[PDB]
Amino acid sequence: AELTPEVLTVPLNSEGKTITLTEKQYLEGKRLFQYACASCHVGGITKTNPSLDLRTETLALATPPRDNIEGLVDYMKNPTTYDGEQEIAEVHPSLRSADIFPKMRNLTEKDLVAIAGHILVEPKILGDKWGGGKVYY
Amino acid sequence: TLTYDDIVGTGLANKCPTLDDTARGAYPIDSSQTYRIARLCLQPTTFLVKEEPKNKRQEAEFVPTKLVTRETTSLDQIQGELKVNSDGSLTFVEEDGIDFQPVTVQMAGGERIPLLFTVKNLVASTQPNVTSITTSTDFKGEFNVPSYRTANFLDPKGRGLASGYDSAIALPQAKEEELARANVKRFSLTKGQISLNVAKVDGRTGEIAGTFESEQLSDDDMGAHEPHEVKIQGVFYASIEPA
Amino acid sequence: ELVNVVDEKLGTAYGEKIDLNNTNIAAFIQYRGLYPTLAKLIVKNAPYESVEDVLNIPGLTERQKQILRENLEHFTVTEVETALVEGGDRYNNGLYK
Amino acid sequence: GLPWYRVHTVLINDPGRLIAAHLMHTALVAGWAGSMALYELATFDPSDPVLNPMWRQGMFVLPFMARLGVTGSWSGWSITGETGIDPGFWSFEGVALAHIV
Amino acid sequence: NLWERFCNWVTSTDNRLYVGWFGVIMIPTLLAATICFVIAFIAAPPVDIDGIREPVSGSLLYGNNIITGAVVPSSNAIGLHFYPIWEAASLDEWLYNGGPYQLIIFHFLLGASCYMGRQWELSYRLGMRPWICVAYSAPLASAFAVFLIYPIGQGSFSDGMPLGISGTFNFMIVFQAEHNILMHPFHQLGVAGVFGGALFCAMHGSLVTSSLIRETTETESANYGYKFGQEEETYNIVAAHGYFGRLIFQYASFNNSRSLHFFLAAWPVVGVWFTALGISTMAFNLNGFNFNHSVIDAKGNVINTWADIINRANLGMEVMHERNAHNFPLDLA
Amino acid sequence: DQKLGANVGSAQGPTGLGKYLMRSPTGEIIFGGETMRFWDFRGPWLEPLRGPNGLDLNKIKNDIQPWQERRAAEYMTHAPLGSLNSVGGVATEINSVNFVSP
Amino acid sequence: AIFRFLLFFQGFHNWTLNPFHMMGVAGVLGGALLCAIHGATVENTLFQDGEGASTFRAFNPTQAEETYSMVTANRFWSQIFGIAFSNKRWLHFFMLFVPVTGLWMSAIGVVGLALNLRSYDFISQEIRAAEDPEFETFYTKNLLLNEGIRAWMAPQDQPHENFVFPEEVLPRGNAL
Amino acid sequence: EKLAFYDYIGNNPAKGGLFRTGPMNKGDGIAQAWKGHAVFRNKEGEELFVRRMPAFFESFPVILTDKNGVVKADIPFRRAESKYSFEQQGVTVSFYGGELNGQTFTDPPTVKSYARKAIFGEIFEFDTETLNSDGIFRTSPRGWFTFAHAVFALLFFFGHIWHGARTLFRDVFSGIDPELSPEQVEWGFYQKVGDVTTRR
Numbered sequence A: 001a002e003l004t005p006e007v008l009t010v011p012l013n014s015e016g017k018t019i020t021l022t023e024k025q026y027l028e029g030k031r032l033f034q035y036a037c038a039s040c041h042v043g044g045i046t047k048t049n050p051s052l053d054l055r056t057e058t059l060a061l062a063t064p065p066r067d068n069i070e071g072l073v074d075y076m077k078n079p080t081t082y083d084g085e086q087e088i089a090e091v092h093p094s095l096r097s098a099d100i101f102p103k104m105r106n107l108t109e110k111d112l113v114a115i116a117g118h119i120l121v122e123p124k125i126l127g128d129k130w131g132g133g134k135v136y137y
Numbered sequence B: 001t002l003t004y005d006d007i008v009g010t011g012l013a014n015k016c017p018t019l020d021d022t023a024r025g026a027y028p029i030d031s032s033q034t035y036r037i038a039r040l041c042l043q044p045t046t047f048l049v050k051e052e053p054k055n056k057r058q059e060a061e062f063v064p065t066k067l068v069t070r071e072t073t074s075l076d077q078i079q080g081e082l083k084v085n086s087d088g089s090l091t092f093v094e095e096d097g098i099d100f101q102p103v104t105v106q107m108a109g110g111e112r113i114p115l116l117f118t119v120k121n122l123v124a125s126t127q128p129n130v131t132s133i134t135t136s137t138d139f140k141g142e143f144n145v146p147s148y149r150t151a152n153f154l155d156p157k158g159r160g161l162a163s164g165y166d167s168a169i170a171l172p173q174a175k176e177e178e179l180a181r182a183n184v185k186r187f188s189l190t191k192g193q194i195s196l197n198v199a200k201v202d203g204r205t206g207e208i209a210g211t212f213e214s215e216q217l218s219d220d221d222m223g224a225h226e227p228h229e230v231k232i233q234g235v236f237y238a239s240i241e242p243a
Numbered sequence C: 001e002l003v004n005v006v007d008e009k010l011g012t013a014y015g016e017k018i019d020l021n022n023t024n025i026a027a028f029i030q031y032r033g034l035y036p037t038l039a040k041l042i043v044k045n046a047p048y049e050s051v052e053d054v055l056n057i058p059g060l061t062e063r064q065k066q067i068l069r070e071n072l073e074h075f076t077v078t079e080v081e082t083a084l085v086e087g088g089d090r091y092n093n094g095l096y097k
Numbered sequence D: 001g002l003p004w005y006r007v008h009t010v011l012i013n014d015p016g017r018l019i020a021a022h023l024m025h026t027a028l029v030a031g032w033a034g035s036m037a038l039y040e041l042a043t044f045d046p047s048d049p050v051l052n053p054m055w056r057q058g059m060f061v062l063p064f065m066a067r068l069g070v071t072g073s074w075s076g077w078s079i080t081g082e083t084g085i086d087p088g089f090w091s092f093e094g095v096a097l098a099h100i101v
Numbered sequence E: 001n002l003w004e005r006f007c008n009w010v011t012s013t014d015n016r017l018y019v020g021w022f023g024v025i026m027i028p029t030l031l032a033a034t035i036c037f038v039i040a041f042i043a044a045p046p047v048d049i050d051g052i053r054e055p056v057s058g059s060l061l062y063g064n065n066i067i068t069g070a071v072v073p074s075s076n077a078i079g080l081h082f083y084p085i086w087e088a089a090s091l092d093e094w095l096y097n098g099g100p101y102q103l104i105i106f107h108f109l110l111g112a113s114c115y116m117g118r119q120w121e122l123s124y125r126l127g128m129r130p131w132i133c134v135a136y137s138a139p140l141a142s143a144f145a146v147f148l149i150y151p152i153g154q155g156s157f158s159d160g161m162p163l164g165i166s167g168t169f170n171f172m173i174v175f176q177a178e179h180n181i182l183m184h185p186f187h188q189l190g191v192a193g194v195f196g197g198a199l200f201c202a203m204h205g206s207l208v209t210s211s212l213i214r215e216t217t218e219t220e221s222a223n224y225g226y227k228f229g230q231e232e233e234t235y236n237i238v239a240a241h242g243y244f245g246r247l248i249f250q251y252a253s254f255n256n257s258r259s260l261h262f263f264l265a266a267w268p269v270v271g272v273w274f275t276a277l278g279i280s281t282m283a284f285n286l287n288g289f290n291f292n293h294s295v296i297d298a299k300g301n302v303i304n305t306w307a308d309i310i311n312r313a314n315l316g317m318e319v320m321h322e323r324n325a326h327n328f329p330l331d332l333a
Numbered sequence F: 001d002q003k004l005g006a007n008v009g010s011a012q013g014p015t016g017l018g019k020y021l022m023r024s025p026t027g028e029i030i031f032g033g034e035t036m037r038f039w040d041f042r043g044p045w046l047e048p049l050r051g052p053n054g055l056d057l058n059k060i061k062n063d064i065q066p067w068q069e070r071r072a073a074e075y076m077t078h079a080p081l082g083s084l085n086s087v088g089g090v091a092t093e094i095n096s097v098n099f100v101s102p
Numbered sequence G: 001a002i003f004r005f006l007l008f009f010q011g012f013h014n015w016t017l018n019p020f021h022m023m024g025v026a027g028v029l030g031g032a033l034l035c036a037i038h039g040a041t042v043e044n045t046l047f048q049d050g051e052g053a054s055t056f057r058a059f060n061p062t063q064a065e066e067t068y069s070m071v072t073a074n075r076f077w078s079q080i081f082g083i084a085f086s087n088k089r090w091l092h093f094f095m096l097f098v099p100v101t102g103l104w105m106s107a108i109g110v111v112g113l114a115l116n117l118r119s120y121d122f123i124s125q126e127i128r129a130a131e132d133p134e135f136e137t138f139y140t141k142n143l144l145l146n147e148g149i150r151a152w153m154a155p156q157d158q159p160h161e162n163f164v165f166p167e168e169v170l171p172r173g174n175a176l
Numbered sequence H: 001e002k003l004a005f006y007d008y009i010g011n012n013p014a015k016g017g018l019f020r021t022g023p024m025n026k027g028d029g030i031a032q033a034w035k036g037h038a039v040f041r042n043k044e045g046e047e048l049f050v051r052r053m054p055a056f057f058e059s060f061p062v063i064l065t066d067k068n069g070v071v072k073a074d075i076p077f078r079r080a081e082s083k084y085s086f087e088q089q090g091v092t093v094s095f096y097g098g099e100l101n102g103q104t105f106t107d108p109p110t111v112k113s114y115a116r117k118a119i120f121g122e123i124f125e126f127d128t129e130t131l132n133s134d135g136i137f138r139t140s141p142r143g144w145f146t147f148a149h150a151v152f153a154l155l156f157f158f159g160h161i162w163h164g165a166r167t168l169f170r171d172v173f174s175g176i177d178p179e180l181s182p183e184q185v186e187w188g189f190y191q192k193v194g195d196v197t198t199r200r
């Protein structure tokens, strides 16, 4: 098995348009995920709220859907609850709360796209390990 | 006005607040104004366990016990609605608070009685024609006693109610009829009765204080054995605000 | 005589759908638009005589009522099991990932 | 003097007493075989060879006698499920008696 | 002067067992710890170790044998709080919360430290070189690590090692679950220390026994060829050196008895120092090596190693240990 | 769980102790679970919720600020637990977080 | 892989409970103790046979006299510990005897485990624990730990069995 | 019934214990009759097969798969998020042959108890009262014989080493020669080790 462009092909929007990430983009997304998110999102789970996770099905059932690149980038800019009824930027890292979350200060749009691409590609690589918790370790 | 650093380690945090000795007033109650218990504290001072005689008919009196779980027994921060009924009786319905404490008391002979000292979902009313809370007001009421262990508790062999094994796995071929009492955990919700006797009133600040006696059952170990009847005696304090 | 009530509840419709009176709130994650606001309202206002009484929760908006109508077929109502709802297990039943 | 773990070294240059010690050991082993067979015969239940065979009953020396051809008892039963079998002298009891003698 | 006579008696080398000033502290503390241990191991009521009102019975009278019996560590509700008898309202409360464990371990640790000091003291009174106490510092450091330092780092004496055989095994298994001690280099150095200590003990014993000079006949024990206090060496050091130098090669063999016995002292003592330090450093949660999901294929699939199998075993222990005591996802202490 | 509508004062854990709030042996209202051993902890993010009798239910219900929630989440996910090769978390954690506390 | 072997024997065989392994542990730890204590005792009862402050040069291999004082060592350990060796030959045979006997006992236990003849459980404790849900010992807790080891380790440790344990059948405690 | 009795893990000699003494019957009772073959079906009528217990496992979960190996039912440990419970899947058990021939059970406690028996292979009725059986497996005389003779063979390896050593080293049994030459054990003097005639 290799990191083929079919593996690195992920939804871009909710309409159905797709994008293909480069391996450098995927590796930079993994590095930035480990830098800014993995302390609470290691393995695709959420440490401080285990009932939600970063599985593609869970992101797809979110409001608005977060199973594409644009939805995940929008979440990184303006995070909300799962039903999209309240904004949670004061307790979740974001660009709009980069003053209280300093690790989000130097994140560019390309960094956000790479992080979103890593989040979307990791289940396709790891199977049930992504978001599975310690059962699948 | 004692800070936390004046209180920690001393045991005063388990004590209910006391009213002054020169305070035996009356707190007036308008039948239109709604009232609340902003703070109900219950500090138990004595646990009595009903003995189980061998014969079917005997005295069956309560015996004293020794507390072994230290100063972890008081219920505090209990809030509720104090409504006035059409008969003039005052009904207290609790909503939330630290309304339960697990307590283990040791009977003579070394046997330990665990119990969930609680006033969970207490509804307590007075006699009719109470227009002012005096030192003769009594609150008689009932509460729910849930199971001492909740449904996720695992016994030493890994059996439980909502989780765990359903059989004795270390005896894979033993007969299961004799072990059905230990294999099948049961959740019990019993009823308790409590009487709160008002002894001191502060008509200015709305505070009342007095003594309580409650009756409930002890832990049954998820239905493994029969519970013991426990009477709890102590003092109480209640802050009555106009809502 | 001695029966495990949780397994008996799994035998009912509690084991197939979301019971409005018994199920832990995290199960409301598995449908769109229920968690956490509508789920909090549903768990707060339980018990329910029937499923469609979830539309009569006080303070519901038109959007939330439409969301509940779209998930009406995913709900059941059974008798309130004491072991499932005591100890605050409808908000935290001790199960995480 | 001799340590305890060397007491039997007095037999090393005494062939007659070494033969006597070997004879005593052989007598002990044969007596064990006879008495073990007698104990097993006292405890064995031969009624159901299908679901209660000898290996379910902790029988240790009975299968060896059965292996070389001793299958019957003077009490009339056999391990193979037959009854009133007439096993002659060489039953389990006869083998045990021969070992004791 | 009564004080001069008492000082002469305390420091006297003519006593059958030397006391000394370290022994003046050591005898009452170790007597108290021993008496309380025997009484608690036979007759203590069950102890709520995890602080969750789930008492664990460890005494013989409450249904234990020698293997399963233990003095159960004090309650998790107590934590690191000092819990003497007079802090409890009654003896029943003190026994319920595991007070005997704190009494025994505090008296034992003080008495064993004074045992080390007493070893120095007697070596000084006899004109000996003083470093036997340094060798004894390795098991003493181990006892301090499992009874004091690990509770301090974890924040509760409930996480100290129970005073029993099966309680010790429980301590080992939960420790591997939480810290992966097998993958810690200090524990590996400790295993090298104890395996090498057993190896070099068997080696030195067999090499000295092999080269014993013939002093007795074939009937008697060879041990009667040595007389206590004799001046000559009872074995041929050169013959043992020749054997062991032909067994491997000449320069892997000690021809110096003093260097050999220093090596015999030094190898297990340094190894046990390192494993005691491993227990203490894991008490501050600096755990053994974590190689979970270290080997990754070209696509990104996890290729398991033996470390992943160890991780599966550790996960089983982790999710089953103290099965009712955890309310939250992370076992932070 | 309080944001989800739970009553944290009356919530009962598996053993019958309070899931979130219990009493220390001297009566103080403290956090439940295994962290009952750590009830002597004092920190600037926790002291605004402490009253004379320990943790106060009303200030828990009404006076928890977003900076305190941020601080609690950050300190929970940077616990001083890690491996010798600097893998953050418990010994059973996978290799993604490079953290050992100073 | 050897660490996996250790954890396998704990989870499946309860090898710590085995008395033959206990004798092996006693032999190995006693051998390490004897090694350390004999080396330290010899090094600290040395005779002064030179003027160097480092004493290793004060030994010549062809010398006839003992390099350390057996009498002083005997008196030291008689007053510290109560008992002491007085026979050097018996001391060194004992140093041979302890770890060798321990290793042989552990080998016997491993033969028993080859036939799955384990010291897994005490039957009296298990009958009591089955009938009494309040009876807990450290041994019963160890049995629960063994159940966890087996269930969580077996699908990957024994891939030929094709174990598919769903998440709901895995024994877990609360939370965690 | 004999053939079915062989297909039962209580007759496996690798299932006993070192100090679980006595006959195999004292383990699990005296076998009385075969209950017959248990066939498990879910509520859609598909046959389910109980995963048998290997000899390594003192305890084993109950897992029911179809013919293609896909897990279809189980007895869950945690029941809050159970999906494959016997109650959810409508698992029933029927018996063919034996005592329970033609009998079908639908009550989930009964079906679960029969599945817990079915992990041991064939299901049998036992008399646990005659010998006061504890319900804990014991090994056969095959296992006890193999254990005793493997242990004895190991100890006799030590005996062979000891007596061969005493045979070949009889002249030095009480000690080595007091006047052993220091130029007989040093390197360089002889050419062949321990041979005086090859001295340089």
Ligand code: CLA
Pocket: D026, D027, D029, D030, D032, D033, D034, D036, D037, D061, D062, D063, D064, D065, D068, D070, D095
């Ligand atoms: C007339 C002599 C005689 C006879 C016919 C029997 C007959 C019997 N004995 Mg017995 N026995 C005897 C004497 C005898 N015994 C003596 C003297 C002793 C005391 C030592 C015993 C001790 C004894 C015990 C302890 C037991 C029996 C048992 C038995 C029964 C099964 C035998 C079996 O499986 O053997 C198996 C025999 C062998 C496998 C022989 C092994 C031979 C080895 C391989 C020889 C190797 C060395 C050889 C010299 C190598 C060179 C060979 C060369 C040809 C190249 C059987 C009824 C068993 C029984 O059922 O008890 C009730 C049992 O447990 N016997």
Ligand code: CLA
Pocket: E172, E194, E195, G005, G006, G007, G009, G010, G014, G015, G016, G021, G024, G025, G028, G029, G102, G103, G106, G107, G108, G110
């Ligand atoms: C206090 C802790 C402790 C101690 C002291 C021991 C002690 C022991 N355990 Mg043990 N154990 C423990 C805890 C402990 N255990 C726990 C908690 C568990 C989990 C249940 C186990 C599980 C366990 C298992 C599973 C086994 C042991 C075994 C043993 C024995 C090992 C003997 C040995 O040296 O084998 C080492 C190996 C040998 C001596 C064989 C010869 C090796 C040759 C000579 C090496 C040649 C090297 C050569 C020069 C090449 C080198 C190359 C180089 C590059 C490496 C010993 C008695 C083993 C046993 O009982 O054996 C019978 C065993 O199988 N233990």
Ligand code: CLA
Pocket: D040, D043, D057, D058, D059, D060, G101, G105, H018, H019, H020, H021, H022, H023, H140, H141, H144, H145, H148, H149
């Ligand atoms: C080769 C030897 C051997 C074998 C394989 C068997 C096999 C059997 N016997 Mg048997 N038996 C034998 C010899 C043997 N026997 C002898 C010599 C006698 C006379 C004493 C008996 C007397 C006897 C009776 C009376 C009974 C049996 C029974 C049984 C059955 C049950 C086994 C059991 O409970 O074991 C249990 C085994 C153990 C608990 C193992 C003992 C472990 C020891 C104690 C280890 C010692 C360690 C040591 C002290 C370490 C020292 C260290 C030091 C050197 C440093 C089984 C078929 C029973 C049965 O079912 O019969 C119907 C029964 O009632 N046997």
Ligand code: CLA
Pocket: D004, D005, D006, D007, D008, D009, H155, H156, H157, H158, H159, H160, H162, H166
């Ligand atoms: C055919 C087997 C056989 C025979 C004839 C001998 C014969 C002898 N051995 Mg030997 N040995 C054997 C097997 C055998 N051994 C095995 C298998 C081992 C390994 C364990 C040894 C290990 C051994 C050592 C280490 C030594 C001897 C010594 C001796 C000599 C003196 C024995 C003595 O006085 O003991 C007297 C014994 C006692 C008074 C009590 C022993 C009780 C034991 C420990 C426990 C109970 C055993 C039990 C009754 C046996 C049951 C039967 C069993 C075989 C199944 C003698 C020539 C000694 C020697 O060479 O002297 C110069 C010596 O030092 N043997």
Ligand SMILES: CC(C)=CCC/C(C)=C/CC/C(C)=C/CC/C(C)=C\CC/C(C)=C\CC/C(C)=C/CC/C(C)=C/CC/C(C)=C/CC/C(C)=C/CC1=CC(=O)C(C)=C(C)C1=O
Pocket: E037, E038, E041, E042, E066, E164, E165, G022, G023, G024, G026, G027, G030, G031, G033, G034, G037, G038, G039, G041, G042, G070, G073, G074, G077, G078, G081, G083, G084, G085, G086, G091, G097, G098, G099, G101, G102
């Ligand atoms: C009822 C109640 C209260 C119960 C108490 C609770 C409790 C749990 C107790 C039970 C304990 C128990 C079950 C123990 C089990 C032990 C166990 C596993 C069994 C033993 C195993 C065994 C039979 C075989 C293993 C192999 C073997 C032979 C081991 C022996 C180990 C052993 C004794 C080693 C020696 C240890 C030791 C301290 C030696 C000191 C030697 C010494 C005095 C040296 C001094 C010295 C050194 C010199 O260098 C010189 C020169 C001189 C001159 C000199 O003097």
Ligand SMILES: CCCCCCCCCCCCCCCC(=O)OC[C@H](CO[C@@H]1O[C@H](CS(=O)(=O)O)[C@@H](O)[C@H](O)[C@H]1O)OC(=O)CCCCCCCCCCCCCCC
Pocket: E009, E015, E016, E017, E018, E019, E026, E027, E030, E031, E034, E035
């Ligand atoms: C449960 C609560 C109740 C507990 C009860 C405890 C009460 C203790 C009462 C003690 C009464 C005296 C008995 C001891 C006598 C004795 O030992 O004789 C030996 C000599 C006798 O006195 C020596 O001998 C001479 C006296 S005589 O002439 O021989 O009478 C004298 O000349 C010499 O100076 C003197 O040193 O004593 C000595 O050698 C010096 C004192 C050493 C005694 C220390 C005690 C051991 C402590 C070990 C701690 C751990 C133990 C754990 C168990 C393994």
Ligand SMILES: CCCCCCCCCCCCCCCC(=O)OC[C@H](COP(=O)(O)OC[C@@H](O)CO)OC(=O)CCCCCCCCCCCCCCC
Pocket: E017, E223, G080, G081, G082, G083, G084, G085, G086, G087, G088, G090, G091, G094
């Ligand atoms: C602080 C006060 C110190 C005193 C504390 C108590 C110390 C007791 C030490 C043991 C005394 C009994 C020794 C008998 C044997 C005896 O008297 O031995 C005395 C013996 C003397 O040896 P010799 O060289 O004089 O022997 C001559 C030879 O020819 C032998 O034949 O010493 C040894 O062999 C030492 C090695 C044995 C190791 C024994 C120590 C074992 C520790 C205890 C184990 C307990 C397990 C169960 C506990 C419940």
Ligand SMILES: CC1=C(/C=C/C(C)=C/C=C/C(C)=C/C=C/C=C(C)/C=C/C=C(C)/C=C/C2=C(C)CCCC2(C)C)C(C)(C)CCC1
Pocket: D028, D029, D030, D031, D032, D035, D100, D101
């Ligand atoms: C403890 C045990 C053991 C051991 C055991 C043994 C070693 C035993 C032995 C046993 C034996 C060793 C037995 C024997 C017996 C014998 C007998 C019982 C005999 C008898 C005889 C008789 C009775 C005879 C008689 C007579 C005479 C004298 C002459 C004429 C003829 C007649 C016949 C009359 C072992 C280690 C294995 C294991 C564990 C347990």
Ligand code: OEX
Pocket: E050, E076, E154, E158, E159, E174, E178, E321, E322, E325, E331, E332, E333, F034
């Ligand atoms: O106490 Mn004894 O072990 Ca140290 O981790 Mn947390 O706490 Mn409990 O769990 Mn895991």
Ligand SMILES: [Cl-]
Pocket: E170, E174, E320, E321, E322, E323, G141
């Ligand atoms: Cl545990």
Ligand SMILES: [Cl-]
Pocket: E325, E326, E327, E328, F032, F033, F034, F035
């Ligand atoms: Cl917790």
